[PDB]
Amino acid sequence: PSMSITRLFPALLECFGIVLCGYIAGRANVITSTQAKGLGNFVSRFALPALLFKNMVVLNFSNVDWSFLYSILIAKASVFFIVCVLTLLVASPDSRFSKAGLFPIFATQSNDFALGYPIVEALYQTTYPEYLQYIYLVAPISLMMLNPIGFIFCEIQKWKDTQNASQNKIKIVGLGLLRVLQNPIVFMVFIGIAFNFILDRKVPVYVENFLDGLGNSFSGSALFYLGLTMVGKIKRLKKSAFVVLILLITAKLLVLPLLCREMVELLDKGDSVVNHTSLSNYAFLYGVFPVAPGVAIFATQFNMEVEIITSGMVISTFVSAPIMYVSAWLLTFPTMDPKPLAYAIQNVSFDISIVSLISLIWSLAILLLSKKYKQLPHMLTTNLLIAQSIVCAGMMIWNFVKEKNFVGQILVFVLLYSSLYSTYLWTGLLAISLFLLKKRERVQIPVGIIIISGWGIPALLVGVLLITGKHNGDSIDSAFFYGKEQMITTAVTLFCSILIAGISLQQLTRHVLLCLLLIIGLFANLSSCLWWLFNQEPGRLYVELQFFCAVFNFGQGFISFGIFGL
Ligand SMILES: CC(C)CCC[C@@H](C)[C@H]1CC[C@H]2[C@@H]3CC=C4C[C@@H](O)CC[C@]4(C)[C@H]3CC[C@]12C
Ligand SMILES: CC(C)CCC[C@@H](C)[C@H]1CC[C@H]2[C@@H]3CC=C4C[C@@H](O)CC[C@]4(C)[C@H]3CC[C@]12C
Ligand SMILES: CC(C)CCC[C@@H](C)[C@H]1CC[C@H]2[C@@H]3CC=C4C[C@@H](O)CC[C@]4(C)[C@H]3CC[C@]12C
Ligand SMILES: CC(C)CCC[C@@H](C)[C@H]1CC[C@H]2[C@@H]3CC=C4C[C@@H](O)CC[C@]4(C)[C@H]3CC[C@]12C
Ligand SMILES: CC(C)CCC[C@@H](C)[C@H]1CC[C@H]2[C@@H]3CC=C4C[C@@H](O)CC[C@]4(C)[C@H]3CC[C@]12C
Ligand SMILES: CC(C)CCC[C@@H](C)[C@H]1CC[C@H]2[C@@H]3CC=C4C[C@@H](O)CC[C@]4(C)[C@H]3CC[C@]12C
Ligand SMILES: CC(C)CCC[C@@H](C)[C@H]1CC[C@H]2[C@@H]3CC=C4C[C@@H](O)CC[C@]4(C)[C@H]3CC[C@]12C
């Protein structure tokens, strides 16, 4: 029904493929600054102002509800106040104000022009078109209110750095207001409002085509420039920097969306509860948008804490996408029939599987071209990577052959679950290898025996499950292919693997990092299995468990890519 979600994934792929192409183009010393600077000038001075002006001429203020605006603005203000007061309380008075001048802006100003707008357009085109007009009401008005406080704090920092007592508060406030008014967004929004008042909701044809041509390329050009502006800005930092960065990113992506949603339910008191639900979903989706590079521009202008802000913007840009996907899907689950839940879990499984598959072949190609697998413990890691690649490929093939052929279906199921159980064991097997390496014992490692074990017990388990189990082909999900017996064998496999990892627990640090991260997902799957078997009656909690289990099962390659990929 409402909230057509199938269009979200292609939009995310488009929006990140453009950024990736821009990044790699600059990376390979192909594009130089000259045209890149020209591209940035075109985006900032011509394309974005044209888009704002054309979308601001046609607004139809007479039927625009302001409850959403109040909710979003006050929630942003609440996060702003919380972060600002915490920064004032915590930061050392040496340069505390500087922090308070930029840090709370990081959690409030988003990239809702270049990134968020395509996403909401894909999500809300044929369902709620009017939501699209809210972005241009939310992004500038916030810049009206919250950011001038940041500028005046930065100016206080600059003044105390200069130690010039002659300057009064009037000068500082004036400089801050001059800085905030100088931005193109402010005065172009004002000009748009003035022209909307003047022309009585009419667009000149002589310039309408010019405005459309200038504004249509803005999204892509801005995405390409953003990709170009991330080539060499991420650098190693200290532990305190890492901690404060994690807190900032969690404030942006975890606190603000929840406050926005809750205040949306609080303020709004209209009927037709479906529209209230849609507004809440839209507010939460708007909360999770990334951080715009405008804050990085401000920091560079002020020449203070530039590297922290830049690195945070870069990292949050990438972190936004998976959170966006999982958030959209999990909010969409409650208003769905169980069979659509099965189809949805198949869709998310296929999507994560293809992306993780690309990551996995990239990592495997790097590893094989390294020729570093011939010594311990890299060959076992290669085996695990191959098992993950095969499970992803089997997931895609199973998605295609869910109701295509019979013998093909059983062979695909056998291959997929043999690879799945192979990864389940190979976690604990790597744990054993690491533990025996910890012993520092000059004893030969049965490499042939250990590999044949790791690749032979899972196949034997699947085979005995097939022999003893009963075929049940009416279940969409692959877990319920055979029934209780498959759940029992998966549960005992998980329990054995977790026991092995717990008893057990040269780049050993990365290996132990992987041999710690995989096991949280191991407990997740085990808990889901025992939840299903013990709780025969369905409670209102296993849906998120199923979604998380599917995510881990088919995207576990991302952990290996992150650790053993650079
Ligand atoms: C970095 C590069 C190599 C990534 C390439 C990703 C490609 C192969 C991915 C990204 C989006 C994907 C598509 C997303 C959705 C669908 C609809 C589905 O019903 C059939 C598969 C199909 C049509 C996918 C085919 C593969 C696809 C085009
Ligand atoms: C539903 C899930 C998958 C959504 C995403 C959650 C996870 C993957 C996200 C949420 C916050 C993220 C962290 C935020 C900040 C940092 C600090 C940076 O210096 C390294 C990455 C790191 C440590 C991120 C790793 C990935 C992370 C833990
Ligand atoms: C499919 C969903 C659920 C998960 C997607 C995988 C996520 C969690 C992974 C895939 C690649 C990962 C990134 C790989 C490399 C880096 C650079 C590092 O300096 C900081 C962390 C960061 C930025 C990682 C953050 C987490 C990350 C984005
Ligand atoms: C997860 C689904 C739903 C959305 C798609 C997200 C994709 C496009 C994202 C998730 C994590 C991202 C990666 C995170 C970190 C890095 C390292 C950096 O040096 C190059 C880009 C690269 C390799 C990113 C490429 C794009 C990426 C793979
Ligand atoms: C019917 C109503 C009440 C359902 C409400 C579901 C809420 C509580 C769920 C749905 C989506 C969820 C989010 C999905 C993904 C992430 C990213 C993770 O790194 C931190 C938690 C966070 C941010 C979740 C917080 C809780 C969340 C907002
Ligand atoms: C499809 C999804 C998973 C995105 C995949 C992105 C990852 C796997 C790949 C795609 C293109 C890759 C980049 C291609 C070229 C280079 C230049 C080289 O000198 C360093 C590595 C670097 C910078 C690669 C990093 C990893 C990379 C970003
Ligand atoms: C499906 C979802 C839940 C997968 C989430 C994967 C997360 C936990 C993974 C993916 C990429 C990983 C990062 C990759 C690289 C590094 C650099 C290393 O020096 C410290 C760990 C760190 C920072 C990893 C932390 C964990 C990490 C963020």
Side-chain angles (χ1 to χ4, degrees):
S2 88
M3 186 66 204
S4 69
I5 184 66
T6 318
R7 265 274 278 151
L8 163 73
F9 192 61
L12 282 161
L13 276 296
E14 288 157 290
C15 295
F16 277 92
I18 318 184
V19 175
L20 174 72
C21 287
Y23 173 65
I24 62 170
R27 266 282 311 124
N29 291 319
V30 168
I31 317 292
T32 184
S33 65
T34 72
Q35 65 274 17
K37 289 184 286 186
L39 187 47
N41 199 6
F42 173 80
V43 172
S44 55
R45 195 187 323 260
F46 305 84
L48 185 143
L51 183 63
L52 294 174
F53 184 11
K54 63 196 265 208
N55 278 113
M56 212 75 178
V57 165
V58 62
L59 288 174
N60 209 356
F61 274 107
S62 296
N63 73 247
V64 166
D65 192 3
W66 300 87
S67 174
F68 197 89
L69 277 296
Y70 304 142
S71 316
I72 301 299
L73 271 298
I74 297 169
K76 289 200 176 227
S78 310
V79 172
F80 185 18
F81 279 161
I82 291 177
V83 178
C84 183
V85 301
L86 267 294
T87 311
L88 273 179
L89 294 174
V90 169
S92 77
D94 184 338
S95 281
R96 166 178 53 224
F97 284 110
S98 77
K99 315 284 183 303
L102 296 172
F103 272 73
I105 297 169
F106 191 104
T108 46
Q109 203 144 300
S110 53
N111 220 344
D112 53 28
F113 283 138
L115 272 65
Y117 186 58
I119 309 309
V120 298
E121 154 166 31
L123 295 173
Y124 304 108
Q125 206 71 359
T126 184
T127 318
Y128 287 78
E130 61 267 20
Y131 286 9
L132 276 75
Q133 73 188 355
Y134 289 143
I135 288 183
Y136 301 112
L137 283 179
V138 175
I141 288 177
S142 183
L143 184 62
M144 295 298 102
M145 315 187 162
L146 294 87
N147 192 359
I149 318 163
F151 302 108
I152 62 170
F153 267 102
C154 295
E155 285 298 329
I156 297 169
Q157 157 84 35
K158 223 168 207 167
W159 170 89
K160 65 92 175 179
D161 291 331
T162 57
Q163 298 95 24
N164 281 116
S166 51
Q167 173 168 20
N168 218 7
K169 297 102 180 170
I170 298 100
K171 269 81 71 176
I172 288 181
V173 175
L175 292 175
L177 269 296
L178 182 87
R179 183 65 60 85
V180 69
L181 271 294
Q182 197 268 333
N183 188 279
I185 300 170
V186 180
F187 59 77
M188 301 265 188
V189 166
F190 278 147
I191 296 186
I193 299 298
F195 270 83
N196 193 0
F197 174 110
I198 288 168
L199 282 72
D200 294 331
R201 195 94 179 291
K202 200 265 182 183
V203 190
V205 176
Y206 195 39
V207 298
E208 175 263 336
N209 46 3
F210 198 51
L211 290 184
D212 283 12
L214 267 290
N216 262 26
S217 54
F218 152 71
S219 199
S221 66
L223 293 169
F224 200 95
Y225 184 54
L226 164 64
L228 294 174
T229 51
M230 295 188 289
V231 54
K233 269 72 67 176
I234 178 164
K235 298 299 145 195
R236 276 275 193 199
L237 294 174
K238 54 194 64 58
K239 291 183 179 181
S240 75
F242 292 165
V243 172
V244 66
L245 183 62
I246 297 169
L247 271 296
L248 279 182
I249 301 184
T250 48
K252 171 68 194 84
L253 289 167
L254 175 59
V255 176
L256 192 152
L258 281 161
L259 303 172
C260 289
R261 180 176 181 176
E262 271 316 310
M263 181 145 168
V264 167
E265 291 90 7
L266 188 153
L267 260 61
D268 183 0
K269 275 317 179 302
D271 208 28
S272 161
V273 298
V274 286
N275 68 11
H276 203 157
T277 317
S278 297
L279 294 174
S280 56
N281 298 295
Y282 186 28
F284 183 78
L285 264 293
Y286 186 84
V288 307
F289 293 157
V291 170
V295 285
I297 303 162
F298 303 158
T300 301
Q301 293 178 356
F302 279 110
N303 194 46
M304 81 175 68
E305 301 107 345
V306 297
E307 61 272 15
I308 297 89
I309 293 294
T310 306
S311 313
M313 191 305 278
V314 166
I315 293 165
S316 73
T317 306
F318 296 132
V319 175
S320 60
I323 314 189
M324 281 215 77
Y325 197 44
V326 298
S327 313
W329 264 124
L330 183 62
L331 282 71
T332 47
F333 291 168
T335 54
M336 291 184 108
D337 206 57
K339 279 80 63 182
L341 274 74
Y343 293 102
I345 205 65
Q346 296 294 321
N347 296 115
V348 57
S349 60
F350 180 89
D351 291 331
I352 309 183
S353 66
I354 192 66
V355 190
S356 57
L357 180 84
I358 302 288
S359 71
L360 281 162
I361 296 89
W362 202 89
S363 62
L364 271 163
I366 301 299
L367 201 42
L368 301 163
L369 292 193
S370 70
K371 276 76 70 177
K372 263 78 177 174
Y373 69 99
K374 292 183 186 293
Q375 59 98 27
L376 270 295
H378 295 285
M379 72 291 291
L380 312 182
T381 310
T382 315
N383 278 283
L384 187 141
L385 289 176
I386 293 162
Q388 277 164 341
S389 309
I390 304 172
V391 73
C392 296
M395 186 65 204
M396 321 185 218
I397 301 164
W398 159 266
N399 182 28
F400 262 61
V401 309
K402 39 180 55 166
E403 279 87 13
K404 258 204 174 181
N405 273 319
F406 200 60
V407 190
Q409 160 193 279
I410 296 89
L411 62 83
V412 164
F413 161 84
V414 165
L415 172 73
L416 169 78
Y417 266 96
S418 84
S419 300
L420 193 52
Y421 298 161
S422 305
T423 45
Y424 284 171
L425 277 74
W426 269 105
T427 305
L429 277 296
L430 211 53
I432 297 169
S433 67
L434 289 186
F435 181 75
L436 61 83
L437 274 174
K438 178 194 182 170
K439 217 174 182 217
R440 306 312 305 123
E441 270 196 335
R442 292 221 173 185
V443 194
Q444 63 75 10
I445 300 179
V447 64
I449 301 299
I450 193 66
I451 298 171
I452 66 169
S453 64
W455 268 120
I457 296 89
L460 174 45
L461 294 174
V462 176
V464 298
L465 183 63
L466 192 173
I467 287 166
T468 61
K470 182 66 177 67
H471 193 167
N472 219 326
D474 52 12
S475 74
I476 297 89
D477 166 353
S478 74
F480 298 80
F481 197 36
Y482 274 39
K484 282 81 65 179
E485 311 76 10
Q486 183 163 352
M487 294 299 291
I488 291 168
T489 187
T490 294
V492 298
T493 300
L494 293 173
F495 182 76
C496 177
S497 53
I498 290 174
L499 279 191
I500 286 163
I503 295 160
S504 303
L505 297 192
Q506 292 294 352
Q507 46 166 21
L508 58 89
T509 61
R510 293 181 181 177
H511 291 94
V512 305
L513 203 170
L514 177 53
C515 292
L516 294 174
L517 276 296
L518 281 193
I519 297 89
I520 308 85
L522 277 160
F523 300 96
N525 262 292
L526 191 144
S527 296
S528 167
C529 287
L530 282 71
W531 193 293
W532 183 257
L533 63 90
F534 184 23
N535 200 16
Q536 285 81 22
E537 57 273 16
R540 211 258 301 163
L541 195 42
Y542 64 91
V543 285
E544 173 36 66
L545 277 296
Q546 281 186 283
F547 182 82
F548 187 27
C549 288
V551 167
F552 173 62
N553 280 338
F554 310 124
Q556 65 183 357
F558 276 129
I559 317 172
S560 60
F561 181 76
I563 303 156
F564 298 98
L566 277 296

